[PDB]
């Protein structure tokens, strides 16, 4: 848990806010993912059927309704998220060689920095979301008309309700984290002045 | 099995019964839930057939009558027990950092908010496994009039006996987990006063 | 090895018999129960096939005649086994802790408690095996009437002769343990008066 | 993470581009391959179908159109820019050895020829992926006519969208790795004289 | 390979036959079937045809014919011939500890024994493979008449040529192990006296 | 790393070639066949087809061109070649545990002979891969008449540019490993005289 402590983005520099709630937060997507990805999301496409006698009609409506999956979209968002982190992490770790071998404001701004970052990755994994995903549930059938299926076909979603559930908690859990950010911000602002 | 113990809640402030019987039995839960997450509920949806000829009632039948699997039911509800635990413990690392870089009764609330904040998630699991499943034990045969499927067709779930017998370890080692929660708090409330 | 070990029950009070006979056919029964798994009992279901045209006559045939897998009820009875000796270490482990922050028959009483458990246990889950398959040996061939098969059908088995070999070796182990338990129970006895 | 940044080519010689950004993104590329290996290029032929009754036109199609797939081009560009940072470090370790069991400049060289190694291998990878795969997109339909396939026949790609979009984010990265390398060279030059 | 050395048996009375070549052809051994397992003995039963529209043939004449694998008897040996070497080191803890909480012969008849042991162990499952399976080559093509098949039928094996290449291995490794042995207790005895 | 390096063969007599140079291309086959293992050569039978109503043809038709997969053949090489140079580090170790409970051109004999093993060994396994595979790259249609097939039939290969590339890759490896064993003794012999 240590490393995912790490990868949240605690600092000498962060407040409470910082080190133990929002370091819980990614934690707990963390897991949640690890739990949804194969179990839930594993058949999406080889489960995923029309009704249609049209050879390829298959893969190009999975390919037309789901152009990237929820659990690769969830996975590039965490990736993203992480990366200011551990790019301090590392600045901290060659100063600190720096110093071995031979100031805190620097540290300071370089935190704020890698907050406002984390902030406009979440915010705009969200809107991606939106406009891929307008509506938070998944339904059970969906019309297709791109070639080469013939006129429109009916096709048949994988496990809706349980992805609908996966998909409440991964969006609850990227609002609070926002939420907490912006408090983050927020808050080492006034302590500044 | 020291990350389970840490998981469970154990603390400086912790007496017996949440030291030594409440992680024991969520390390129980957690072994119990390994040995049975893909060996049984493995191929619960691939096994899953209707006697119909119409293309897509497999997968609604079977969204129908299993809107969230068992051990993904299981799952989360064991990440948000363990959830307040590392809350707690990570609030201590805080604590004493603060103290480093330079009371009991903060311990002692957010000990017994925690324990208190365990015993809701259970409880609230236990209720929502009681909506969604009323009783304990899976039948072979079930009847399912769900659209596109034409009158009603009988459909059949793979290992009935096998996940009622893991169901009912489960819900007996999420009740005895219940008891103790409640134990523990009224013996601190006790000990208080 | 050495978590094996302390899952078995090795005590400060054991005598030989508890501390290297009864570990290593512990670690033996946990190696060939690792090695049979998936290997041999992976495709119990998947190939298991009935003489019929009646959908859904192999999945209920298949329960009817393995309610629980041997291989679940091996790994359930490992679990239970190992359960009070963790009991007991983390009991070990409060009474020392508590010692560092500020006698010898708990302990004694403790110890002779849990390998009484263990007994139990053993005696429990043979006695549970011998309920469901009275015949140590598996059969090719199936005689099954559930409904909805019509009349009589035939189905059969995957690997019967492979399957019967590991039963035989799992339950000599499971016999050599109960023997040696009440070999150490009335050792300690004895040695106590 | 740091074997990461120990294949990433860190040195003690390294400045703060080659130290905390350029192992950033080595980092990155690692994990998002990670991601997406198996998950959407786990069934790019078994997916892969042709309009067609001719035996063995399917496999045929499948490696006319795709000699090599982008994950293993993509594994073998990591390990081959792996390799000098791991010769340099094994090249320290020896000296260092052989000082124990008894100059700068020869560690600045083999620095800056590592480094050149490393551009040159990014490289090279950029312009085999360019001759291989012209287009950053990839295509639903295909058209075959490679013996014994008669005439001209349709095929169909698994996950176009998905493995396009992955392919620009692996692009990007490695354009950026290629940018990073010569300014590198640039600026170890510059501080030279 | 720490781990593997102590399974193969090195003592502190062991020679240099039994310290450095003994455990060598064991980690050997270990590192062949890991390699074999599953990339070559995986689909046995699952590629395993006959020619015939009788159904449950195949699984009858697969039982037939391969009573138990080739894989599985190999592993069963590996823990039975490591079984004595960890008895023996439980033992030597047990004597340190009684030493540290208050003789060199029972050491050396110890290792004897265990010795021996293994030798037994190697030798009795080098005579059952030799009843299972007489020859060290398999054939492609095998002739069935076991129920329900009708007259004869003719069966096809999986990979004859690897598998016969694999099994040679492991024959030779285990006649020299066996050699050694033997070679370990004549020196161990000559040394006596 | 240190485990691969360990497995190289570098000694306190090596010198840079064999230190630096060695353990980097062992280091590299170990990951290109990791990588290449599963991912390229998992679908090798399954997917291996031929054109015919016969049963049984595929099986034996693949079994009469593919007697061992080059990926299995790779994971002996690597094994035995690795095999030497633990030997040697064992031998080591007993001779300092000899010392510590109580010459250099031991030591010096020892390394050279191990190091024409290792020689000898890559060689042979170049020959017989030569044996069984003439040329380097893979043809996409195979001619077979292994009865029971009736006259002749086409059978089609799974991959076989991409299985060509990585061959390429590893036979180049080997080589290269060839030529720096030969340089090594006889650069050793040079120091030697």
Redesign the interface.
């Known amino acids: 848990?240590g490393?995912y402590?790490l990868l949240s983005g605690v600092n000498?520099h962060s407040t409470?806010i910082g080190?133990?709630?929002l370091?819980?937060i990614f934690?707990?997507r963390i897991?949640?993912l690890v739990?949804?990805?194969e179990?839930?999301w594993g058949?999406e496409?080889?489960?995923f059927?029309?009704?249609t006698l049209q050879?390829?009609c298959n893969?190009?409506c999975?390919?037309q309704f789901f152009?990237?999956?929820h659990?690769?979209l969830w996975?590039?968002q965490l990736?993203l998220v992480s990366?200011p982190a551990?790019?301090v992490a590392?600045?901290v770790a060659?100063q600190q060689h720096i110093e071995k071998?031979m100031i805190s404001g620097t540290l300071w701004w370089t935190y704020v920095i890698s907050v406002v970052f984390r902030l406009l990755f979440e915010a705009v994994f969200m809107y991606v979301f939106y406009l891929l995903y307008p509506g938070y549930a998944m339904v059970?059938?969906v019309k297709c008309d791109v070639?080469?299926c013939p006129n429109t076909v009916?096709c048949?979603?994988?496990?809706?309700?349980?992805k609908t559930?996966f998909t409440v908690?991964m969006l609850a859990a990227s609002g609070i984290c926002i939420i907490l950010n912006v408090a983050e911000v927020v808050y080492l602002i006034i302590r500044a002045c």
Chains 1, 2, 3, 4, 5, 6 share one sequence.
Do not use: Q
């Open positions: 848990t490393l402590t000498r409470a080190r133990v709630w370091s819980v934690i707990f897991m949640v739990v949804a990805a179990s839930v058949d496409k080889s489960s059927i029309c009704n050879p390829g893969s190009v999975y390919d152009p990237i999956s659990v690769r996975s590039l990736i990366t551990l790019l590392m600045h060659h071998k059970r059938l070639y080469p009916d048949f979603v994988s496990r809706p309700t349980e559930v908690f």
